Amino acid sequence: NYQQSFVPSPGARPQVNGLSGRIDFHWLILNPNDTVTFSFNGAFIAPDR
Amino acid sequence: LGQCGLLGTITGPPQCDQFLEFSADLIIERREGSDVCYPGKFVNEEALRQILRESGGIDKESMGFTYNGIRTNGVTSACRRSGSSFYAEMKWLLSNTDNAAFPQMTKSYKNTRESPAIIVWGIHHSVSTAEQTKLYGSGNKLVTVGSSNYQQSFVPSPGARPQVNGLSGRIDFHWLILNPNDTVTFSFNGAFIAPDRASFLRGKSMGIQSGVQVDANCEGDCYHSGGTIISNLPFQNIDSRAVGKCPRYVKQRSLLLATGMKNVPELFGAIAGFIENGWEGLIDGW
Amino acid sequence: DIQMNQSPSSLSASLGDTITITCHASQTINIWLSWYQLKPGNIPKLLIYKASNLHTGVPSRFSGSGSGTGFTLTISSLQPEDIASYYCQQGQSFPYTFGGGTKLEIK
Amino acid sequence: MVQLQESGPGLVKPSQSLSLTCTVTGYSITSDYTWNWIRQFPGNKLEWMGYISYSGSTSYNPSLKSRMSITRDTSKNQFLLQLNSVTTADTATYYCTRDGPYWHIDVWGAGTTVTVSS
């Protein structure tokens, strides 16, 4: 039920307590037997559980 | 506002130069209020119209940008005051040598007050790639707009559209909010319509919409589009989008409430009881 | 109509001093001013429009800002070519009115 | 380079008319901006007369309502000021200016001095 193809935003930001670059986390839901596929050539922060 | 469309005060079109910094306790929008002069539109724009129906006014302050290698006064032929102007509040970051290049920019602004701003920038959708070289240069275009709670990196759409009153290309304006001490950064290599003044608020008002005249001698508080309701009665069959402090809309139109006994001309069984008729020759007592 | 009371009528300044001139629109015009120098002996010049943005070609030494019913420029580090008279114009409501005019003086 | 230059006579007799013009080079007077005239009272005090648009509409100063006209000439790039029923007060310096937007006024002409006495 889902297809996004997200893309980074290399830009300068203000600093929150030392760091400028952000990291955004999005979230989906699976149903039983259903399958997700992640593909990437950079800048991805995978889950593990 | 009259011929001023309420979301134009933040942008300054020719129909709203007399309202750029107003102050109100009762704003009124008219049927003929237009928000733009170039063809374009806002985003989330019913919400922004609901910040301002109670804001009691606006108070701009400058932001202080400075450009070089780059012109700032490209002009359009529809935002006309005597001639080719643009908006009052925004500018037009355009290329200097008309097809040679465009340098990449980066600018910023830190809110410094006790109040949140309302800051609005602009992205310019060229009509082609033939008139995105003439206006700006070469390469891809991206406008990166980031703060604490915000990161977008918008991009133009060079395409042909129908003409609204002479022009095909649109211009879209998006808007964010800053908090105190917070900072926005705009960066771009083309097709950006920068702000020049941010915008602050005043207070507490209410908004209505109507089509009848502004009056000043009359005392009342329940304001809908066909006038003003004034009554000591708890119920009204007049309108049901009536704002203010109204009575409440019922569907009945008459509901009579007694204030005398049972009328008997000529639970306890004396009125219409074992005393048969009333008196009409009795005029002082009951 | 609208009255534009540019005050004071004259004041005296030496070389290198920061001075202000202050127009006073008698009714809310809220952003609309521009500052003109026209001295007796030359053509006039443009300095500032929108009450904040300086004209293209002006030396960046000169500035001004303001809104509401009070507007003010800023001139410091004067020159021999700085001595003139200075007028302000309200562009809100027709007819156009200008101000009284200040005369720049050496103390 | 938009340059504006006034011209006209030296001495004007009272209760007569006055015809001045302004020549404009570098910019067509039909390209979209208006075109003003501005006097100069003795005592260094400025005042507004009226404009003619690039199409040819005019507005006037509402205390010069019935005694003033301004027209133009598209051929030799000029516009012509006309004022009548004059008194002693009208000895001034007249400045043909190119207006800008409602923002401001841009381009000023050098001016010329008129004299109205018999």
Author numbering:
A (entry chain A): 200 to 248
B (entry chain A): 52 to 317, 328 to 347
C (entry chain C): 1 to 107
D (entry chain B): 1 to 118
Quote the paper.
The hemagglutinin (HA) protein of the influenza virus is responsible for receptor engagement and is, therefore, one of the major targets for studying the virus-neutralizing mechanism and screening neutralizing antibodies (nAbs) against the virus. Subsequently, it undergoes a low-pH-induced, irreversible conformational change that is required for viral entry through membrane fusion.
In the HA-Fab complexes, the densities that are responsible for the HA trimer and the Fab of the nAbs are clearly defined, revealing that all the Fabs bind to the head domain of HA but target different sites. The 1H9 and 2D7 engaged sites are located on the side of the HA head and their Fabs point nearly horizontally from the side of each HA promoter, whereas C4H4 binds to a site on the top of HA and its Fabs extend obliquely upward from the HA head. The most parts of 1H9 and 2D7 Fab binding sites are overlapped and span the RBD and vestigial esterase domain (VED). The BSAs of the H and L chains of the 2D7 Fab are 367.8 Å2 and 359.0 Å2, respectively. There are 10 shared amino acids between the epitope of 1H9 and 2D7. In the 2D7 Fab-HA complex, two additional hydrogen bonds are formed between the residues HA N133 and A149 and Fab Y55L and K56L, suggesting that 2D7 has a stronger binding affinity for HA than that of 1H9. The epitope of 2D7 has two more polar amino acids (negatively charged E81 and positively charged K152) and is, therefore, more polar than that of 1H9. Glu is negatively charged and has a bulky side chain, which created a repulsive force and steric hindrance with Y34H of the 1H9 and 2D7 Fabs (interatomic distance <1 Å).
